Symmetry: C2
Subunit: 449 residues, 2 copies
């Protein structure tokens, strides 16, 4: 009977065409919300990020996978909610830049300082700031960094690398685009070199491609980054079997799961949206990606396994899980890809809430780094961008529009967006907050001195 | 100090380029939120609707008028927040229609039943359902209905009229489009005729034009609707000074303020966004509309006057206030008009919160009927639709994009959106809810049975 309740059912209660049939509430919530408030310490924190998962992305995925009156048992089940701002800074002027990229936003919640687009773990003066994961490890807590994206990708890379440009994946890119970060120039090195130095306990995702690179200097000069990883004691897994037979993860044998050369496989496939696609082409039903595999751990599986391995630390743990390709698919104007990745994240959120509700001292937060392009529009819409009609769980058509770029990729947008939480200190996400407040919220809930 | 706190400040606390400077919080919110939870009765309710005011609209307006790290002392200050769904229904199938218009959404929170786009006060079978305003009046509470739109517009009209199409403004359009509701055919009459019957204690807004039409039947056949109101005991006012002179409003002497022929004047002027407007043109600075006026009451003034007149009822009151032109200007791809109307709504929200914190038993809710088109995008965006660069309070450029219609009007979008509240029973807007839950939340808070 976990004192702090997870919402069990906020689907429409009945017949949506009848008075009250679309209500998601069965009665007053004052007592349940009083019950969801505690300022006791967070022993653990699990932060899940849906990259580019603004309210529009949440709504479109729900409409399609669960119906308009449906309910995500993970994403929609956190009882304390608010909206936060994620604007970045113009590097030269220090004024706001209203639409952040992935790097500046992830720098914001992981360091508590606003920065310029493309920066990771540094401010507009290129000065390094400690990340919540670096700080959690320093305090003796176990640390996890999970993502379906390549690990050099901004979201999980911000927790372990401090570079002046997110493009500095390896020695090569670094020496070129982050000259002062390049190892052979006295800096701390490429994103992957600093990730190896950071040494979290559990690091799972894709991005094996960069590890085939060789250090230009340093103790492991000439050796490949994977060679360097093997040499520094890391426990390297590459598939679901090898990951599941892992029984422990610590500093002596930190875990590095490289499940793909680049990003991990998307869950669902569909045609890309097109000009007047909702008018000129048939409504679409998403299809399961045949190449996604029971040999590749799902986000939910990587989450569960990271939780099992991190919860053995009695001091506690900090874990960040990213459903990364929601952003990727929204950029590609591919509704099916995008929605399937939201559905993927919801399964990981359910594993987190199921663990937190039993454990009792776990603060779980679900949010996104920034908003995105996709909009849900009327079925008859004639829009200038890319559109597509989808057959939803309701047996009705929903049309999605991508209308903010004539270029190859659709763009991020600056709208404030949902952040939701459950457990100790979850009140700190309610109302209007800033993305940097989340750093302070996590740091304080863990009591990191 | 009335135990329930209104947020005093959620702006960035310091230098946004420094660690912690972008924080909107100054410490833990658990105690603050516990103090914001009460399940005692709401003696009064003030519902403020920004038409089309989704999170994107709130953010764009805050970024322009208050700076990225600024704070809307009204809109951003409600402590309990959540996200609600506003889908309508397809009339024929009864399945969800993912993008509602203003009529079906206002019908949903005012009656508690989902309906089809364009319906007012009736369900998909065209059955009338009592509204929260009619129920309040039936229980002896005073009632107010305020809007900057013409009063026949969907948002205020849904509280007092039951017609099969929102276009049925007066006798002529009702005869043509809602034959079943036409007075000469045995129906309840046009929107304006039903509004005159509903007899709220205070009704203020635009829409004088339709009152020049004459009734086709009934006791006032052949007389204009304005002559009808006069003969029925209404006190008619048409400007700021006549409204100010009003001393009481009740069933014997109900107040009807008609301040414009159509919609009331927008607060700010600016050019319409254009194709590649952010590449091809210089940035826009909004400017006050000369056509505003000390002779035209502002939304904040109409809100205050309504509060003063309705609070003389010892049993309590229900008041809806609509900032209407946010929607009109978002459809017109006019950033300045759109933002100025959000600033306008923020002032009315402040008046409502100021009253509520002092009174202690008033539930204030602030939300929108549906989301809209506008998106905040990167300055160098090259988009297919209409865009505009704007000079914000920060001394930086923000670019807005309207990209969902090649047609003249930009359109509504289906994303769930913010709903926020303050006062008794405010917990009921937190987490995921449906727009129809708002009807039940209001009914229960006032203890209407
Ligand atoms: Co991102
Ligand atoms: Co990411
Ligand atoms: Co992106
Ligand atoms: Co509307
Ligand atoms: Co309206
Ligand atoms: Co509209």
């Amino acid at each position: 009977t976990p004192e702090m309740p997870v919402l069990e059912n906020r689907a429409a209660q009945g017949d949506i065409t009848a008075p009250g049939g679309a209500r998601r509430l069965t009665g007053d919530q004052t007592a349940a919300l009083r019950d969801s408030l505690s300022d006791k310490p967070a022993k653990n924190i699990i932060l899940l990020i849906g990259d580019g998962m603004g309210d529009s992305e949440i709504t479109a995925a729900r409409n399609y996978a669960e119906g308009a009156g449906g309910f995500f048992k993970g994403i929609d089940a956190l009882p304390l909610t608010g909206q936060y701002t994620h604007y970045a800074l113009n590097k030269k002027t220090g004024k706001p830049d209203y639409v952040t990229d992935s790097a500046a936003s992830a720098t914001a919640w992981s360091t508590g300082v606003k920065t310029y687009n493309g920066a990771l773990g540094v401010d507009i003066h290129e000065k390094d700031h400690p990340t919540i994961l670096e700080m959690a490890k320093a305090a003796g807590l176990a640390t996890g960094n999970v993502s379906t994206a390549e690990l050099q990708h901004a979201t999980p890379a911000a927790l372990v690398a401090h570079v002046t440009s997110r493009k500095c994946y390896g020695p090569s890119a670094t020496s070129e685009k982050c000259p002062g970060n390049a190892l052979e120039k006295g800096g701390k090195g490429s994103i992957t070199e600093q990730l190896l130095n950071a040494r979290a306990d559990v690091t799972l995702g894709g991005g094996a491609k960069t590890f085939a690179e060789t250090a230009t200097a340093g103790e492991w000069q000439g050796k490949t980054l994977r060679e360097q990883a093997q040499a520094r004691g890391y426990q390297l897994v590459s598939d679901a079997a090898s990951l599941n037979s892992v029984t422990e993860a610590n500093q002596q044998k930190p875990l590095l799961g490289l499940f793909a050369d680049g990003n991990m496989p998307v869950r669902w496939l569909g045609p890309k949206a097109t000009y007047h696609g909702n008018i000129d082409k048939p409504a679409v039903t998403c299809t399961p990606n045949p190449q996604r595999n029971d040999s590749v751990p799902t986000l939910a599986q990587m989450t569960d396994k990271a939780i099992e391995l991190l919860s053995k630390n009695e001091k506690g743990f900090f874990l960040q899980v990213e459903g990364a390709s929601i952003d990727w698919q929204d950029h590609a104007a591919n509704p099916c890809g995008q929605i399937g990745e939201t559905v993927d994240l919801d399964e990981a959120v359910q594993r987190a809430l199921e663990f937190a509700k039993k454990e009792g001292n776990t603060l779980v937060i679900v949010t996104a780094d920034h908003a995105h392009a996709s909009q849900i529009v009327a079925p008859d819409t004639k829009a200038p961008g890319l559109t597509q009609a989808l057959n939803t769980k309701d047996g009705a058509v929903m049309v999605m529009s991508y209308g903010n770029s004539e270029e190859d990729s659709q763009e991020h947008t600056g709208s404030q967006l949902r952040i939701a939480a459950y457990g100790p200190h979850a009140a700190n996400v309610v109302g209007l907050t800033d993305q940097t407040d989340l750093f302070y919220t996590m740091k304080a809930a863990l009591g990191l001195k």
